[PDB]
Amino acid sequence: MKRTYQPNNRKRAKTHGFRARMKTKSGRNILARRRAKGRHQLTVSD
Amino acid sequence: RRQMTTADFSGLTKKRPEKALTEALPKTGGRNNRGRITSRFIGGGHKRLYRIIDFKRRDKSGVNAKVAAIEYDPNRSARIALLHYADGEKRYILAPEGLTVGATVNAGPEAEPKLGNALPLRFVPVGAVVHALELVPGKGAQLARSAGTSVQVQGKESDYVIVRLPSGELRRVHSECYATIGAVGNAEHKNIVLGKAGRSRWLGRKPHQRGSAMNPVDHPHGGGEGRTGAGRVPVTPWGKPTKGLKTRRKRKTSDRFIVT
Amino acid sequence: SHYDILQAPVISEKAYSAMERGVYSFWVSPKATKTEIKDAIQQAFGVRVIGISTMNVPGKRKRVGRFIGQRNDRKKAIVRLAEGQSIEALAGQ
RNA sequence: AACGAUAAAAGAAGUGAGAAUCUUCUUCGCCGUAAGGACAAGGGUUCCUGGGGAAGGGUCGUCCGCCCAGGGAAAGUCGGGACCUAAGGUGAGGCCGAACGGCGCAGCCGAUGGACAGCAGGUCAAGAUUCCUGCACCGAUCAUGUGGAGUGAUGGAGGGACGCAUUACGCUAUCCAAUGCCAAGCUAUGGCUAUGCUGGUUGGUACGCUCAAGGGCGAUCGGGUCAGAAAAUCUACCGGUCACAUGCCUCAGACGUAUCGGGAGCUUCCUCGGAAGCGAAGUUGGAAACGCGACGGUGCCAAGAAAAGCUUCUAAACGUUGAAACAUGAUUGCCCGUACCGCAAACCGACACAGGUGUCCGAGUGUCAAUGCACUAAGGCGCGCGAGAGAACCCUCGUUAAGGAACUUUGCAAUCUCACCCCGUAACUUCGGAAGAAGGGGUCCCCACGCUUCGCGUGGGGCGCAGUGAAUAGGCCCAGGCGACUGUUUACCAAAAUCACAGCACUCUGCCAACACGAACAGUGGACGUAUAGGGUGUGACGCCUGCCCGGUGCCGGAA
RNA sequence: GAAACGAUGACUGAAUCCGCGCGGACCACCGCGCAAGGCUAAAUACUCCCAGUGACCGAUAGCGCAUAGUACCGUGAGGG
Ligand SMILES: [Mg+2]
Ligand SMILES: [Mg+2]
Ligand SMILES: [Mg+2]
Ligand SMILES: [Mg+2]
Ligand SMILES: [Mg+2]
Ligand SMILES: [Mg+2]
Ligand SMILES: [Mg+2]
Ligand SMILES: [Mg+2]
Ligand SMILES: [Mg+2]
Ligand SMILES: [Mg+2]
Ligand SMILES: [Mg+2]
Ligand SMILES: [Mg+2]
Ligand SMILES: [Mg+2]
Ligand SMILES: [Mg+2]
Ligand SMILES: [Mg+2]
Ligand SMILES: [Mg+2]
Ligand SMILES: [Mg+2]
Ligand SMILES: [Mg+2]
Ligand SMILES: [Mg+2]
């Protein structure tokens, strides 16, 4: 039973990363939306 | 001829001589552009490289050459002939039927109508049979590079020569284009029986998949209980038999009696 | 400058027992190089340095609350000298 | 009801408030191509020491991967960065687009791959090609001296540089034998008194005329300008000369000497347990790699990266009295990762989960071979509830009288069968196959003779109910329907008579091809393909064959 | 729709003061206006934020929160 989650550092950093949210504005949208979300923690500190 | 095999579940092969392996670009396999898959299948292969090969053969004009070896390379389906010139420059060309190893090949407008020689159509004799023809002066040869193919000469116009393309189509090709004497040898590919399933794979991926296997979602022929279908059409409902897919164009008046 | 950039001397069983091989050791400022550390330590205790090594240490305990931890994050550098030895009077700990 | 595999545990001894469970001893059973060992990913102090006993642990708990505190992780050489490039990503200029934006040459990023300087030991409670000891090696800056003159670029060239299968030779790791060598000792049970028993039996560096299979290399004069944008002494060429086998070049690895290690044990001290001191021999015979010598040899069709470092040549520039090159000291080595888990109690699965996870090493005996099978070594472990009872029922196994498919939807299930050698083997056949057809026989131990190697055959003899003596280990055949065939498919009720399939046919397409993605006279895929090509469609090896009807429907052509 | 007028996407493309646009097909009278150039607080909207009050809540209410977007769930967006 190979599970859905197969942790890869360089992956979770390539997709989802702050630098990753940089390239597009859907992700910068996500950023500011998250900042106001309460003080959440945006992806790559987690 | 061809190679054959005793009964182990087999038929044919080809026969390849003159071994070298020399000096050319890599290439990668892929089936599509920025998006999803365009041209269906052919995602397999033996990881061929590419041999940049001269077609136009202009700048070697006036300079003779000797055939070095004849190597059989993919992305071609033709014999590749190696050339060495008097310049010291080596170059690749296609290898017409019956070209021995180490004959003499010369380019230019002055050249003699012998095997492998490059020279424009205006000099090409009446009824002669040649391959590797440009549609336009310069660029390269888009005509008669394939398996066992050739094009003959049907007459002259002004700048134009009437040529016979190997669908059996008559066309007007101007005499300002270079051409290469002879038919591309290629043995005969129609011979080789391509073995069994996966002999495909050797050169390219999983072949025809019948839309009638598919489902209404997938293709038109899809759906139903049984083996059948009604209205006869492709991915998009154009249809295969006898529908001209051509458009009204420029070279269309540079074309005469296309029938078949 | 010289007197910061190295924080505090290491204290342990295998620490100051190795102080007797002429090998000293201290926690330095985590962003540092062996060169800057060389310059610093030499300009401090007035002895040339041959042997050098350095490393990077984590953190993370917690006791109370939902507070669950923090990384403190040190770095420990270790030095051997040439036959010129015995830093200051403080090699006598 | 359950306490998460039916790999069992037992006694003594210790500690403690309390012990089936924690510690020690002595036995026992279990894995041993693993259930041992080493890494990668991922986890994040889980490591070590000293504590602790709430909860967590399926019981307990003095215990732990839990709780507290302290400690522990060292690199010019290993892996990565300061080097290079693949897919991909990107991208000034540039080509598009209602916006936000889609593209795109160079360049750049990007290891999964290319390039690149050390090995051997020692040891803290916890690190080691990192620290220390012995002896290495690489680049850099500079100093004495040699030489005593050219260095020789973002540019050229060479070279990096690559497939699959199979295979001759030589060697090592490494394992095996011994009335080799060395060391320790006693051994009684009936005997052995060593010819028994147990253990150990070379690693690095250096020189050396020693031995060595294997491995790859032609050399210079010159010619044409049209070739490498230009240049050239470099490279590609056409030519002349000497080189056919001797020839050159390097030597994996062996041998000797040396030397630094290690080495069975050995001695002393012991804070009750480890420290510290010492130190023997290193033989003959056999086996042997997927490793090394090597970029070997032959064959085959589907024809098997790039780019830097690197080798040679000029352009430019400075210098041609103080160059490049050499060794000879010195000085110099920046950044990040190194603990621990890592086939699992620490990673992904809510769980201390019978699941999942890529690479490496993986011993011996018996066995044709082997990573198989059984047992075992080193190593690890008995699975964190126990103890009794021996009813129905239930699961997983063992044997069965007489019968042998009478059972049942169906021999479903479960037997029988089983390895290797010999003999022998049908219809049909695409002459390959069917075939391991079907059957029959051998198999262990001792002795003599022979033989082409482990062994094998012959003869004779012995024992048991039985001799692939235990484990691994095909039941078979006669007819058919379907598909030819290997293959593929419904992650979790359908593996098939489905899909694919080679082959065959219809048709499209003259190349900014038809065709397909697309805000788009952008771009790209077809294809760096060109009409024995490329698309779509339907049939489905092969063999014999594919008939009648176009009124209606689509399709091509025509013209009142 | 009898569809005037403003507004552009494509073709077209006049006058200039005895002139031009309008007045809901269109015509004439009769009026109203002078396009193709630009800027221009104020009165209007909103509440991250500060103050004041309330026939507003008072711990299952009141914001999700008597502080937490934390714990916790998800690869993530997100939820909480
Ligand atoms: Mg279907
Ligand atoms: Mg449809
Ligand atoms: Mg249908
Ligand atoms: Mg803690
Ligand atoms: Mg249990
Ligand atoms: Mg047990
Ligand atoms: Mg066992
Ligand atoms: Mg408990
Ligand atoms: Mg012995
Ligand atoms: Mg357990
Ligand atoms: Mg074994
Ligand atoms: Mg019975
Ligand atoms: Mg019986
Ligand atoms: Mg019956
Ligand atoms: Mg019955
Ligand atoms: Mg059965
Ligand atoms: Mg089938
Ligand atoms: Mg099934
Ligand atoms: Mg018919």
Ranges of each domain in chain A: 1-46
CATH 3.10.20.30 fits C1-93, yes or no: no
SS3 C37: helix
Cβ-contact B117, B111 below 8 angstroms: yes
Q: How was this structure determined?
A: X-ray
Q: Which stretches of chain C are assigned E, i.e. beta strand? A: 6-9, 23-28, 49-57, 74-81
| CA gap B203, A29 in Å, rounded | 47
| CA gap C54, C77 in Å, rounded | 4
Distance B74 CA to D88 C1' (A): 26
Token look-up 């040439």 returns: C82
Ranges of each domain in chain C: 1-93
Domain topology for A1-46: Helix Hairpins (1.10.287)
Helices and strands in chain A: count of H runs, count of E runs: 3, 0
Question: Six-digit token pair at A10?
Answer: 């360089």
Given CA atoms B109, B184, B64, B84 in this order, what sign does their dihedral have? positive
Chain D bases having any atom below 7 Å from a protein CB: 41-45, 68-76, 86-90, 100-104, 124-126, 130-132, 223-228, 235-238, 300-306, 332-338, 347-349, 355-357, 430-432, 484-486, 498-503, 506-518, 522-540, 554-557
Count of residues in chain C: 93
- Domains of chain B, first to last: 1-103 (2.40.50.140), 107-184 (no CATH), 185-260 (4.10.950.10)
C74-81: strand order across its sheet: C6-9, C23-28, C74-81, C49-57
The string of DSSP letters for B132-199 reads -B-SSSSS---BS-STT--EEEEEE-SSEEEEEETTTEEEEEETTSEEEES-B----TTT----STTH
Q: What angle do CA B94, B47, B26 make, to 5 degrees?
A: 60
Cβ-contact B110, B64 below 8 angstroms: no
Cβ-contact B5, B163 below 8 angstroms: no
* Phi and psi at residue C6, to the nearest 5°: -130, 125
| CA gap A37, C47 in Å, rounded | 57
CA atoms within 13 A on the CB side of B122: 11
